[PDB]
Amino acid sequence: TVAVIEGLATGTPRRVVNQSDAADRVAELGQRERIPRVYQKSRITTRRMAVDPLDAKFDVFRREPATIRDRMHLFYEHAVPLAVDVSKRALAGLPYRAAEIGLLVLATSTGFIAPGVDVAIVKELGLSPSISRVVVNFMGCAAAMNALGTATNYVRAHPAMKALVVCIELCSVNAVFADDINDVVIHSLFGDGCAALVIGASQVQEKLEPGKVVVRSSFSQLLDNTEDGIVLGVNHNGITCELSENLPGYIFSGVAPVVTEMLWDNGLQISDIDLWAIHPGGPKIIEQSVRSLGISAELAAQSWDVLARFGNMLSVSLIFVLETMVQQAESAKAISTGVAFAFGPGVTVEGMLFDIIRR
Amino acid sequence: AQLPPAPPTTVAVIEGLATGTPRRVVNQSDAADRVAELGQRERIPRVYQKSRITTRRMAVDPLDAKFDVFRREPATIRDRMHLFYEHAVPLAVDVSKRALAGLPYRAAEIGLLVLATSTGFIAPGVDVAIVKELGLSPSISRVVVNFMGCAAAMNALGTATNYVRAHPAMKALVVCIELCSVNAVFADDINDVVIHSLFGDGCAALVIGASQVQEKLEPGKVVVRSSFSQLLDNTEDGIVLGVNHNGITCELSENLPGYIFSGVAPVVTEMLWDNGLQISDIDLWAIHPGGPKIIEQSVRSLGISAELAAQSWDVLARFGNMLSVSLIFVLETMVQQAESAKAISTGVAFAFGPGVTVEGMLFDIIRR
Numbered sequence: 001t002v003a004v005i006e007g008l009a010t011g012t013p014r015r016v017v018n019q020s021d022a023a024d025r026v027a028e029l030g031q032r033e034r035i036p037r038v039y040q041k042s043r044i045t046t047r048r049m050a051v052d053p054l055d056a057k058f059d060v061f062r063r064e065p066a067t068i069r070d071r072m073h074l075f076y077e078h079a080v081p082l083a084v085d086v087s088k089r090a091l092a093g094l095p096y097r098a099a100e101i102g103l104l105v106l107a108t109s110t111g112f113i114a115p116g117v118d119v120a121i122v123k124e125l126g127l128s129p130s131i132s133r134v135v136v137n138f139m140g141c142a143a144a145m146n147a148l149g150t151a152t153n154y155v156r157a158h159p160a161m162k163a164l165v166v167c168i169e170l171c172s173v174n175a176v177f178a179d180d181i182n183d184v185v186i187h188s189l190f191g192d193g194c195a196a197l198v199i200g201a202s203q204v205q206e207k208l209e210p211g212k213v214v215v216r217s218s219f220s221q222l223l224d225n226t227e228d229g230i231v232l233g234v235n236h237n238g239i240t241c242e243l244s245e246n247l248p249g250y251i252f253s254g255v256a257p258v259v260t261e262m263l264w265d266n267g268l269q270i271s272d273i274d275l276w277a278i279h280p281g282g283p284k285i286i287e288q289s290v291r292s293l294g295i296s297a298e299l300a301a302q303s304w305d306v307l308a309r310f311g312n313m314l315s316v317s318l319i320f321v322l323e324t325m326v327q328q329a330e331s332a333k334a335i336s337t338g339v340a341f342a343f344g345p346g347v348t349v350e351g352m353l354f355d356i357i358r359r
Numbered sequence: 360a361q362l363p364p365a366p367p368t369t370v371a372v373i374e375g376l377a378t379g380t381p382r383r384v385v386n387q388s389d390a391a392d393r394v395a396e397l398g399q400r401e402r403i404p405r406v407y408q409k410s411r412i413t414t415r416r417m418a419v420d421p422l423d424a425k426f427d428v429f430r431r432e433p434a435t436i437r438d439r440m441h442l443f444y445e446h447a448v449p450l451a452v453d454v455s456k457r458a459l460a461g462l463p464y465r466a467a468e469i470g471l472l473v474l475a476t477s478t479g480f481i482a483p484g485v486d487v488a489i490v491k492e493l494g495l496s497p498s499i500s501r502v503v504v505n506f507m508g509c510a511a512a513m514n515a516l517g518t519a520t521n522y523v524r525a526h527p528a529m530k531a532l533v534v535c536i537e538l539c540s541v542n543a544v545f546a547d548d549i550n551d552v553v554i555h556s557l558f559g560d561g562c563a564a565l566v567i568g569a570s571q572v573q574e575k576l577e578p579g580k581v582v583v584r585s586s587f588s589q590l591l592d593n594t595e596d597g598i599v600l601g602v603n604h605n606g607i608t609c610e611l612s613e614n615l616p617g618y619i620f621s622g623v624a625p626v627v628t629e630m631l632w633d634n635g636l637q638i639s640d641i642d643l644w645a646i647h648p649g650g651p652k653i654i655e656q657s658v659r660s661l662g663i664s665a666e667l668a669a670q671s672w673d674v675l676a677r678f679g680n681m682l683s684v685s686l687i688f689v690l691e692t693m694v695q696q697a698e699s700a701k702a703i704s705t706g707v708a709f710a711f712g713p714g715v716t717v718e719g720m721l722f723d724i725i726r727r
């Protein structure tokens with residue numbers, strides 16, 4: 001039996017924020033020379049935001065302390081609509097009736113409330129009240145893989161059932177514009193987004209149709225001594241992320257050994273891979289991932305594009321890249337083989353081997 | 360023939376189970392008096408003698424001289440999550456070890472670690488520390504389940520269940536850790552006073568594995584026969600969880616017990632029917648001991664003898680409500696002492712999660 005991504009959709013809040021403008025706007029808020037620098041190296045052109053953190057209204061609110069609760073409600077306010085629309089689209093193409101969707105996995109690291117977006121999706125879409133649900137929080141930029149794994153196991157355990165995977169990330173809702181350098185960095189890289197996957201099980205013999213993605217092998221790797229690499233926390237005025245200057249190096253030395261072993265277990269080499277869905281969390285995250293594998297820089301083309309158009313949307317980013325690859329073939333071969341990976345908190349390398357069926 | 364692939368035919372079994380809580384024992388009577396000290400504080404004594412709780416454990420002493428200066432300050436949420444991590448790690452590492460202690464499973468055999476909580480939230484969390492502390496494989500699969508409340512042990516267990524049945528050679532480790540004492544605030548409203556009189560601290564872990572139906576399992580093993588979930592119509596306001604500047608909180612509706620009463624019977628009855636059973640066939644009712652009103656209505660809904668809820672009352676009296684952890688404390692008591700002489704006791708366990716979802720399972724405890 002094989003696990004398949006039979007449906008996929010992505011969405012984003014309508015508001016388009018221009019980095020060139022964001023830079024100017026944020027700078028206005030001494031050593032304001034820095035801001036223009038960090039926004040130039042971001043390699044981001046635009047990112048979507050559910051909320052304009054620099055809006056005259058949110059400005060007063062932003063400067064206030066003890067506002068996480070209000071911010072979590074804001075998260076819910078804007079997340080529900082987006083996740084519903086993106087989930088509806090992920091299913092729009094399949095015939096599956098509500099009774100065939102037995103699991104809903106919701107992943108987020110930017111909002112905490114119960115009942116949450118998962119409950120809203122079940123009611124809004126008309127899914128079974130008896131559908132299984134799991135909410136994956138604080139697994140960061142790599143959550144889509146942890147989520148997909150849960151759906152993969154589910155579907156393999158219940159071959160006649162389908163799973164819905166929804167990743168929602170609304171960073172704009174936690175904007176604070178603090179003084180430190182790390183805060184200035186994430187505020188220049190993070191964006192808003194949503195994506196959903198419809199997973200199913202299929203016989204090996206079944207001839208799948210074009211566009212379908214077979215999840216061949218998933219993998220995880222807690223990297224020794226890198227715990228300070230990616231930190232997530234909850235502050236009185238919002239959720240934060242604290243990236244370590246050592247992260248890109250942790251990435252340079254951690255990606256290659258992991259990927260190489262996993263491929264070898266599948267009789268493949270790095271030079272055999274057609275697609276490299278590298279998590280576009282930032283110029284250096286991509287930069288060092290490519291350097292670790294020693295592959296051509298162009299192989300990360302799809303990853304840079306996503307970063308350029310949406311910035312880092314956390315767990316969502318990886319699925320946008322996958323969509324790009326499902327939409328635009330990189331060769332004329334039937335079936336393209338790719339590898340996807342992103343990085344989680346304890347600094348865990350998370351990924352999968354996958355096949356995109358071209359014809 | 361594009362039919363669906365054949366389903367795994369193995370059954371998930373809880374092969375290891377451990378329980379644990381911080382060492383500090385808080386006496387409910389003393390708690391009432393000490394909280395009462397914080398016009399007409401008559402409100403405290405009532406909302407305490409009606410709790411049906413004798414003791415509960417706490418990693419932190421909320422009324423301690425130190426914390427009473429920190430307890431009243433705003434914007435302390437970040438420090439409280441660090442407080443959570445500091446106390447959660449030692450306790451979770453210890454309980455996880457106790458659950459694996461008797462099994463011959465080598466580290467490479469444990470392929471999944473599910474961690475559930477609704478009282479923490481931190482970057483590398485408790486899950487990472489467990490793998491490092493117990494020397495689990497760096498490549499183990501991990502899933503963190505937050506804010507699914509009092510019924511999270513079921514969502515977590517279901518995840519381990521699918522994993523194990525999909526990969527029959529591996530085992531899964533489930534860990535529920537709840538540290539309420541870390542979020543103590545002592546606000547004015549009844550809901551807050553009520554929560555602070557009911558919530559306690561605790562930890563529990565399960566070791567899951569796949570088993571072939573003809574295998575003669577040994578006494579104490581628990582077979583997870585069937586699981587179920589049910590979102591109850593128009594009950595969103597029943598169990599509300601949120602994050603405040605001074606800590607995580609839970610807001611319960613006056614209508615909750617009414618949602619429980621009319622929600623339990625229909626779901627439990629439908630699920631048992633799927634397994635050729637009725638409510639009267641069941642030995643053991645592991646009802647989530649969230650509080651007197653929750654146990655109360657669950658039993659009425661089922662139309663069963665109050666004595667069939669002894670295990671649940673016992674846990675509530677000795678530990679208070681430890682959220683996701685409580686259901687597992689309940690299961691351990693049923694394991695340690697048979698309720699009848701029949702070989703193989705059949706039971707149903709269930710708890711309530713936000714949105715108000717009935718979460719539960721049908722199970723078998725092998726006596727001989």
Ligand SMILES: CCCCCCCCCCCCCC(=O)O
Nearest residue numbers: 109171172174175187190240241
């Ligand atoms: C789990 C980590 C959450 C990090 C949230 C960071 C929120 C601030 C950055 C995103 C919004 C930027 C808005 C702007 O600067 O124009």
Ligand SMILES: CCCCCCCCCCCCCC(=O)O
Nearest residue numbers: 477539540542543554555558609
């Ligand atoms: C996810 C729900 C979190 C609820 C946290 C409630 C914290 C206050 C109650 C627990 C501490 C009680 C301390 C006491 O009064 O003795």
